[PDB]
Design a protein around this ligand. Structure first.
Ligand SMILES: Cc1cc2nc3c(=O)[nH]c(=O)nc-3n(C[C@H](O)[C@H](O)[C@H](O)COP(=O)(O)OP(=O)(O)OC[C@H]3OC(n4cnc5c(N)ncnc54)[C@H](O)[C@@H]3O)c2cc1C
Ligand SMILES: Cc1cc2nc3c(=O)[nH]c(=O)nc-3n(C[C@H](O)[C@H](O)[C@H](O)COP(=O)(O)OP(=O)(O)OC[C@H]3OC(n4cnc5c(N)ncnc54)[C@H](O)[C@@H]3O)c2cc1C
Ligand SMILES: Cc1cc2nc3c(=O)[nH]c(=O)nc-3n(C[C@H](O)[C@H](O)[C@H](O)COP(=O)(O)OP(=O)(O)OC[C@H]3O[C@@H](n4cnc5c(N)ncnc54)[C@H](O)[C@@H]3O)c2cc1C
Ligand SMILES: Cc1cc2nc3c(=O)[nH]c(=O)nc-3n(C[C@H](O)[C@H](O)[C@H](O)COP(=O)(O)OP(=O)(O)OC[C@H]3O[C@@H](n4cnc5c(N)ncnc54)[C@H](O)[C@@H]3O)c2cc1C
Lengths: 213, 214, 214, 211
């Protein structure tokens, strides 16, 4: 299960432990269709969040550094990001689409904005290459690369922390770029834990976008 | 996969996410070679790169005396769900004479076991009586002894589990929790043999897991 | 500041880092009505991170059944007396007859208080017989009841402290820990008045702190 | 607090506040409310046997100004609290490595020219940023063209135990030189405020080498 985000990014499900019933078993501390869902909604509405910590996901994410920086602020989770000492490195950059600027009356055509960004990216990247070729270590030369450079990471997180992530990132107040990733995370969450996801939207979700999309 | 511990306790595996390769994939940040994969596991363990092992997760169902659970619950990097004494088998851990078969006492070890059993029976009886009288469970239960068995679900990742083993699968820890740590270690070994072996070889700070098999 | 709780317990403030302004500085990231205005803004908009920069260290004496509920709050630091090696005062929480006010019981409340006291006496006396006989404390103490008082140090930041209050300073929590939560709230209010008020007005999810003064 | 240490060309690590000192760990370990000799002995005992929880009762709050590539590595330390400047909503300064930063590395061009080339691309990226902002482009979008050597600022509250883990990982020759410099500043302040704990740390638990 993979979802493409932005121009070159993505969110892919690597593994998952449990499902809605994992939270049910944990809540009852042990080991009926309607009875189980009722328990899930009960836990959600009353704020009994601990049982959902027993559902865990591992995602593989490709996102721009500025998005990853905001993402990594979520401390109750595990991350492993690219370094280039265990796997090969790649150089791609997030170039906003003209549509991304819709809504703002910019004196510069949204098409020209996309071009200027692409322009600087190319120049920074070429400078980077020029430095490496001259013998400058990568850890130094890389500092000239822009924040829109794509990176990749593995993210393992339990359902409770995931719902906190959605509360903050699947919201109109969050930067549009991370909103997109949050939407993809929500879709995968819904596919693996439909009962929990539904209960979440109904009683605990604090954001807005998940109720519109 | 369930292992009996003490007189009425146990450690049961409920679920597990991943295996040794999960840490390998995480370290390389790649989703998609035994010799080299096992070498990487040893390398990570040897140089202290522990984050990759956080991508292996276990969920256990444990039945242990409260005095043991209190020590267990001090391990904060994990998730717990315990039986609610306020809302809810009423069983207790009675040490066998063999548990004292090592200290010099003024009374036979068997006598100690009898004394413990006796007071537990009296406390339990008092509890049931209070409950019969309409006294709320949350109040009546305060007379129950620390050897009362409780149960909880424990979800923990491999890195945190290894920290648990470093501290509890050791002769300095109380004998009772050592027994549970041994069972946790056995299940860990079965599901992640490569990580477990690398752990014992490069990072394990305790003593018993290098003396006792599986 | 030492506040007495229950019959022999207490909550004592050991140390504190910062005040309301610590959160303001953190939110602004730079080392008054406008400042207080900011605190309220943060609280109403859900900006909780700035309050993580205010930290408290408390010394608490409480019955084990209360401590176990307390220790479920993982985002904090704890150091408690050792049941295996620490010297204890051997004091127990005996509910007052008023504790059962409201519950229709077969026997009178004073009777319940009496029975609890009797079982505690028997358990304690049995414990004494074991220790005097040579039984190690780590084993002998398992017969002691859950109402035995213990002590611990608790270091926690304001954000986690507020989460603790949301859960324990509430009618759904056991009356005994509610009492401790009230004391914690009292100390929080004295050191961080602006944050405390903003909390009650915008984020507090409990009920008792909106009716019980300070 | 008040302590401040300059790092790199425009960065710094400033001590904002501190709760406790070495005695805070001693009291927590004994879980109560002796003498200097026995107390320092207890600190070494704790450090030696890995009884690290008592040190969680010592807390620091730092104000740090560092380039984003350094901050990114720093923020991987989850057991701590952070508050950083929002790029979405500064004085825009950048870390320009000194020619000496390339000592030991045989480069095709003079080290001075490398510093120049870095300064040049940074200038072009910044000027592009300003042009986008002036045209009405949202800051959150325009800022993505800025380089990783852009300076940011943040408050960091962390306890002594977590700080020691931070030092074991960053105060090491295997860490990038830039973060090593910051780790040395953190260690310096730690030493100043908790002499006993720091000394014990260096003697029995520190796994790095530069300290
Ligand atoms: C030379 C060098 C190379 C590096 N290479 C890479 C790389 O290739 N990829 C990469 O992603 N990072 C890399 N890092 C960053 C490394 O992963 C960091 O040290 C780590 O992210 C932060 O450390 P920590 O886990 O010890 O600290 P904290 O996150 O602050 O945690 C402190 C302690 O609590 C723990 N802990 C916290 N949360 C959890 C949890 N959820 N589960 C289990 N235990 C937990 C552990 O016992 C830990 O030591 C590198 C660092 C250095 C110095
Ligand atoms: C032989 C023995 C004797 C003991 N004696 C005592 C005693 O006298 N008094 C007592 O109270 N307890 C005692 N304990 C219990 C001890 O406090 C526990 O081992 C500890 O609380 C749980 O371990 P941990 O911190 O390593 O694990 P976890 O809480 O699971 O944490 C794992 C890692 O994340 C970390 N971490 C998590 N949270 C924080 C945080 N807030 N700040 C900094 N780092 C953090 C550390 O790197 C840690 O190793 C004893 C245990 C043993 C085995
Ligand atoms: C629109 C928007 C604007 C933002 N602006 C800024 C800004 O200007 N500056 C900035 O620094 N960040 C900013 N952020 C980041 C914001 O602080 C993140 O939501 C936060 O860092 C990650 O959330 P968390 O604390 O809820 O999650 P996690 O770190 O994953 O924690 C989950 C839960 O555990 C908790 N928790 C974890 N660790 C601790 C701890 N040490 N102490 C107390 N509780 C803890 C809380 O209950 C928390 O909700 C912004 C985010 C958004 C969406
Ligand atoms: C009326 C009442 C009834 C209760 N009944 C029961 C019961 O039947 N069984 C039982 O076991 N407990 C029960 N509890 C205890 C309940 O589980 C506690 O509230 C909880 O253990 C501690 O709360 P916390 O998660 O909010 O806090 P903390 O552990 O201090 O965490 C603070 C924040 O960080 C978070 N966080 C920390 N660690 C993790 C993690 N590993 N994964 C995801 N998020 C994390 C969350 O955002 C959290 O709110 C009850 C409590 C009350 C008040």
């Amino acid at each position: 299960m993979k979802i493409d985000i932005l121009d070159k990014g993505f969110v892919e499900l690597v593994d998952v432990m449990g499902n809605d019933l994992s939270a049910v078993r944990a809540a009852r501390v042990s080991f009926d269709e309607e009875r189980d869902r009722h328990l899930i909604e009960y836990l959600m509405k009353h704020g009994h969040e601990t049982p959902f910590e027993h559902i865990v996901f591992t995602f593989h994410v490709k996102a721009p550094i500025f998005v990853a920086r905001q993402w990594f602020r979520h401390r109750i989770a595990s991350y492993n990001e690219l370094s280039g000492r265990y796997s090969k490195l790649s150089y791609e950059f997030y170039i906003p689409s003209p549509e991304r600027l819709e809504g703002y009356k910019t004196t510069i055509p949204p098409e020209r904005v996309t071009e200027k960004i692409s322009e600087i990216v190319d120049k920074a990247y070429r400078t980077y290459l020029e430095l490496i070729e001259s013998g400058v270590p990568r850890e130094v030369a890389r500092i000239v690369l822009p924040l829109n450079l794509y990176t990749r990471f593995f993210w393992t997180v339990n359902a409770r922390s995931l719902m906190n992530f959605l509360n903050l990132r699947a919201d109109s107040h969050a930067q549009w770029e991370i909103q997109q990733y949050a939407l993809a995370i929500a879709r995968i969450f819904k596919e693996k834990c439909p009962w929990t996801f539904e209960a979440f939207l109904k009683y605990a979700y604090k954001g807005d976008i998940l109720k519109e999309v």
